[PDB]
């Protein structure tokens, strides 16, 4: 029921870290990329709640992943320069925590997303979207549950269950007041 | 604010007159999207008019709707298919013995609005909630949607009142749908 | 040099025929298919060029293929009744020989059409057009000179040596001065 | 009847008003589509740095063209690219000491002209007439063509009045080239 069963490699290589290591925390979950049309919007408003609501529970976390248009083609290696000197550039990093790239859709995606896609089948603002160019589903088996883009949101409570879903046009700082409402 | 299925029509296989199928009120409706060179043409299209003949007269109504999205499947032309399924595939002399109508797509911005309908009532098979297609090559209308028919030969079960009811796969048997059928006859 | 190297199975099964039993023989090969804008023109071209000139030395072979638009989907058994029925239907039957379905683009096309290919890398009427909506390309690998659609045109010497290419557009009864020339 | 290159203009990366390459009449020219984040970024920068260097003197220029129809591997803009260049791919500290123009096409019907022409006049690079695309969910413009740029960094050789002279594949090193281009700036 929850997604403590699952780790994941920091974007710097090393060991995995368990989500479990974060029992009792509100966790925000982004599937990520440095070129993409919210990169800066998504990225940006990520280190806002972090730094906002960090000391009173949440963690956010971010998977970089390159199934939507290519937009993550950087190596693990090569993000946090892409995200400080290209876009947002101007000196940006991450206050948060970055994972190694992964794939969310398809056989080869992450277990954690696999897992979140079974239980929250589809975003809460949009329940209907999945691509507008077919050319750009590229992965295989596609199913009705798969992320739509970069940057869909799971919101998971503080006893590590999904609670909700928010679709790639969904601002990541409009998720605050359900996440203030888990805090408190 | 929530339509039914009566708010839409279709025209028929052979041309002319949409029929509205606000006619059909007290019918229990089966709606399959449907092929001719599909691998389950012959097993739904036997089906189909199995159930026609035995709950016809209790009042099913079969709707088949020819539907070219999946594999190009249907590529014979509205005056092309009877012959295809009584020459070709089923073969043997097969003649459908419910309502086909004109060809159309079911998914995408072009889709019949009976169908962009059908599939906002009832967002994903009941069997199967979660597969859309294997072969991502094969999606190739647009949008695409969570709730897209996913191949040829998923179905619909619509009440007597017009309100969807059911939604089954492609791989969910026709002949699987007579007791939610009987229940509605009943 | 030539096309005597290869073999197909007839579209009713049994053993293959080796093309070396067709030497001395101009011939025209077709990938061919039951459901195409061109099934009419081409099929009906095609025995009217067998009929005239057949008891000269030509040789007509189609080449059943689903890999454009799946305009052959019908199984092996099924082609002739489609032909026959539906599509010229009327009656209508081939007076050449037609083949077991087969792919002539990518990785698993019939060997034949691999050479030939290679032979003639583009037709000789439109050297530049390949597909116009690129989701109809779906084989693997894509090549320079694969065939672009149904019923493009092969003209093979008495020699078995290919000599030149038509594209889907060119019409097969256009063929015939060609063909004259060669049997003359 | 037949064009030439200088019958052709670009922008500047930058931006601001296109050079028309007709101001290039007696110097060999070396086109390549590029991009910032392909398998060979590294390689065939370092390479056209190196050519640009060494044989610049002699009448070699090095034109660079990005574009991202091939795994969306030139999706930063116009803006961005050097910077990508810089502080990530190759990364540090690199510039291209050759021209870079604006993101464009280079095949399909938005393709820029000069490469609808250069196209044209070579169509197959000269070491791999065949092979166009291994995985054919890559090909994604429209139309599709027999000539068409199979990946990033295709390489264009033209001579010093204007009629390209050949084209090398994306697997044939731009620092392979020089042997070409020292024949004609001999």
Redesign the interface.
């Known amino acids: 029921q929850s997604v403590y069963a699952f780790s994941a490699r920091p974007l710097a290589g090393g060991e995995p870290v368990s989500l479990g290591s974060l029992r009792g925390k509100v966790l925000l979950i982004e599937n990520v990329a440095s ?1 993409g049309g919210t990169t800066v919007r998504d990225y940006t408003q990520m280190n806002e709640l972090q730094r906002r609501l960090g000391p009173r529970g949440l963690v956010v976390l971010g998977f970089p992943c390159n199934q939507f ?3 993550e ?2 190596k693990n290696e ?1 993000i946090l ?2 995200l ?4 947002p ?1 101007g000196g940006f990093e991450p206050n948060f925590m970055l994972f190694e790239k992964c794939e969310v859709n398809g056989a080869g995606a992450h277990p954690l997303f696999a897992f979140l896609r ?1 239980a929250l ?2 975003p809460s603002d949009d ?9 750009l ?10 992320v739509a883009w970069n940057f869909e949101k799971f919101l998971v409570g503080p006893d590590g269950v999904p609670l909700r879903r928010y679709s790639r046009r969904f601002q990541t700082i409009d998720i605050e007041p359900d996440i203030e409402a888990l805090l408190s």
Chains 1, 3 share one sequence.
């Open positions: 070129l248009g290519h937009q083609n950087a090569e320069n892409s400080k000197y290209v876009r550039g079974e089948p589809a329940a209907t979207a999945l691509m507008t160019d077919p050319k589903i590229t992965w295989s088996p596609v199913c009705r549950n798969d």
